Amino acid sequence: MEATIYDNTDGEVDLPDVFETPVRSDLIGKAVRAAQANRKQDYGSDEYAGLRTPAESFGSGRGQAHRVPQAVKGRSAHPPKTEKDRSLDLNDKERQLAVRSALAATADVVVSDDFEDLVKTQEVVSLLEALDVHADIDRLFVTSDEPSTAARNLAGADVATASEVNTEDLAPGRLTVFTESALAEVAER
Amino acid sequence: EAKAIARYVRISPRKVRLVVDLIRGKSLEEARNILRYTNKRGAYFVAKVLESAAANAVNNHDLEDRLYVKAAYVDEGPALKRVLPRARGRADIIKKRTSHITVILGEK
Amino acid sequence: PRAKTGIVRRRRHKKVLKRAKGFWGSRSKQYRNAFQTLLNAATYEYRDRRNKKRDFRRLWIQRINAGARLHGMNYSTFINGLKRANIDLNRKVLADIAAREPEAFKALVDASRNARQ
Amino acid sequence: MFAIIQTGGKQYRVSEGDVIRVESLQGEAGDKVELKALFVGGEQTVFGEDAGKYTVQAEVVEHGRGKKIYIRKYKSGVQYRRRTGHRQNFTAIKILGIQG
RNA sequence: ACCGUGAGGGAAAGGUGAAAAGAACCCCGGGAGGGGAGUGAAAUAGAGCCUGAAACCGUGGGCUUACAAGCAGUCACGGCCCCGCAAGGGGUUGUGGCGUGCCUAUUGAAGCAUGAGCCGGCGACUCACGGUCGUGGGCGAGCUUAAGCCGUUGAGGCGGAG
RNA sequence: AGGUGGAGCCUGGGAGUGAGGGCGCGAGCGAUAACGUCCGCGUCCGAGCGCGGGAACAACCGAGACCGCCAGCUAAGGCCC
RNA sequence: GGGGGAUGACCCCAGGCGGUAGGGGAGCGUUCCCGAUGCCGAUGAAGGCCGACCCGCGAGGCGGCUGGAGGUAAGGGAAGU
């Protein structure tokens, strides 16, 4: 539906059943999730130290009791185990799915191919004053196959491609635009 | 009114304590003979912390004599953790419980 | 993943402490038996919580006698006569009366004695 | 000015000094309201009569406020590994002793 | 540094300030250290000198103490003392009234069974690969290895042995 | 049959103790001796089946502890102090 | 559990509610990663010091004094709690 065409005074495109649809928060986040995930890092606390030194835990029958943990700086107890499998491979289907319905959420904004041409990050200050606001606030670049040159740089960068530009992408709250070839990712859809 | 003092004071906080607990709240000049002719150490000391006391005042805190010690006290701190005979094996240290020494000198 | 619990525990304690009036020499600040002594005091209060209302059931008990007898008789008499009552039955306040308003008390005292014999 | 009726509980010995009164969330709501309170303790100006003589007339007092639990704590504890804590309840809405 | 002949063990201890402008001079004093002046936004920021809590030692004040028992104490009633949430509460208790601490292991515990002198901080059901039920949800044939490519942010997307 | 009323049955995940005593009774042993032990029928306690009583006393008689200090009837047990 | 719940909630009565291993449900603060069309503070971050409003609660808020610079997340996520 209200597939608004850029250039504004120019044409209007149709809404693809796809996007249309309802919503699926659950998956929603999920998509999310299986994001940061496969995308964090890792850490831990000494293997040597935390089980590093010799140790004469002391005889006994003397006034004491006993190279392990529970007397200082040393030991750990179950710490950063770098050996901390961090990944989280969501699932294909899963994923894709998300972005989708995801985007669907986006709809709730049409980048005329013709733009795949403009040649200065001050021509953005332009096609800007075209239609600004707060949602632009969000914004969210993206051409269709080979990014929106210079369009890529400014105080809101980010240039997905009609392929490659998912939820991690904008999914977040956010608001943006896609060069047809963009909706070339819809096909991906 | 004014006051005298001094920390890092090597001595039996306690002992000290008796010190004033005497000459305590009383006429200057007066006790000024208590510690002059009393006994146990501290005195000496104690005395001292009365002169830069009587002084400080008149000098920069001002009416002589008519003065005395509205109040006087001592505190311990800093210790002197001291090592002694290894339980003939393990250490046994005492502590010359450093010693603070404040004391008032206000005018009648 | 540091846990410097810190600042926190300390607090708690303060907590209790408060729970910590100035009771007995020590506990006073006894960050233990401090705490303890508590538990104790508590439950105590409790049982006291329901207690009292008793200590009363009796209190009036005497201040009551003080009179119930005064005139000339006990609380197994009165009582009996009292319940001979019909549109009037109470006990608590009764006392704190016999003493507050002599006449008043004095009264019933009669209507009573009678009801009885 | 000093009477002694009795409500869903004696709670009596009054006249005008509004007496913190047991709940009653059905007639109360009535802010500064008026309502009847059976007697049975006629003590006025040094003259008395059966609390059964009474049980005929009575009084009334204006539904004043809604005292909010006057603090009171209940350390529920025991050496027997059982603790816990709940604060006061009993309020009540206040109301003056409308005597008659 | 330190105990060990040796092989070896193996600590503690960081933080003034915007910068020293780091305290000339005068005072009691053998000095250290304390009294003034001066820097200064503040030095109860002052030289191991940011925050600087508790335990623990002091100095004054309120109340309280000499025919009196229990850690405790908490319920009642009373007098002194203060009412920046006033006709209600603060604090302290004189009496009386009912009261065996606290943890582990125990048939059973006040304990005379053990655990702990006091305070502060560390300190104990975790992660991975499997499998196992339950549940949140994507398609019913469902689902992905490893890798190839794409990668301020770095954007996932193809890979079909299993 | 069922007055009841709220236990019952199967499938399935998660368990704990795997050694207790005390009392009445019916038996075993035992000097019909033990706060002895050994099996049974009910209860009892479970570190709270916390409160009442029997002075004090888990525990034996009564009792089932959501909470309400200045209510009311009783239980068992009591009422010269 | 059940009689209608508009999202609350409200009404009846049935109906208990003492509980350690141990089983099920619900909540609280601790340091971090979001800043799901989120940013406060030199007329104080925060910790500290003290309190007769908010909650069954574990905590909250809020006001007075301290102290030199931070970090808070209305919501979901994580864990050396």
UniProtKB/Swiss-Prot annotation, chain B:
Q: Which GO terms describe its molecular function?
A: rRNA binding; structural constituent of ribosome
Protein keywords: Ribonucleoprotein, Ribosomal protein, RNA-binding, rRNA-binding
Determine if rRNA-binding is one of this entry's keywords: yes
UniProt keyword Transmembrane, yes or no: no
A single Pfam family it belongs to is Ribosomal_L22
For this record, the Gene Ontology CC terms, alphabetical, are: cytosolic large ribosomal subunit
In Gene Ontology terms, what is a biological process of this protein?
A: translation
Family, per the entry?
Belongs to the universal ribosomal protein uL22 family.
Describe, as the record does, how this protein assembles with itself and its partners. Part of the 50S ribosomal subunit.
The record's function comment reads:
This protein binds specifically to 23S rRNA; its binding is stimulated by other ribosomal proteins, e.g. L4, L17, and L20. It is important during the early stages of 50S assembly. It makes multiple contacts with different domains of the 23S rRNA in the assembled 50S subunit and ribosome.
- Put simply, this protein is called Large ribosomal subunit protein uL22
Native organism? Thermus thermophilus
Q: Which gene encodes it?
A: rplV
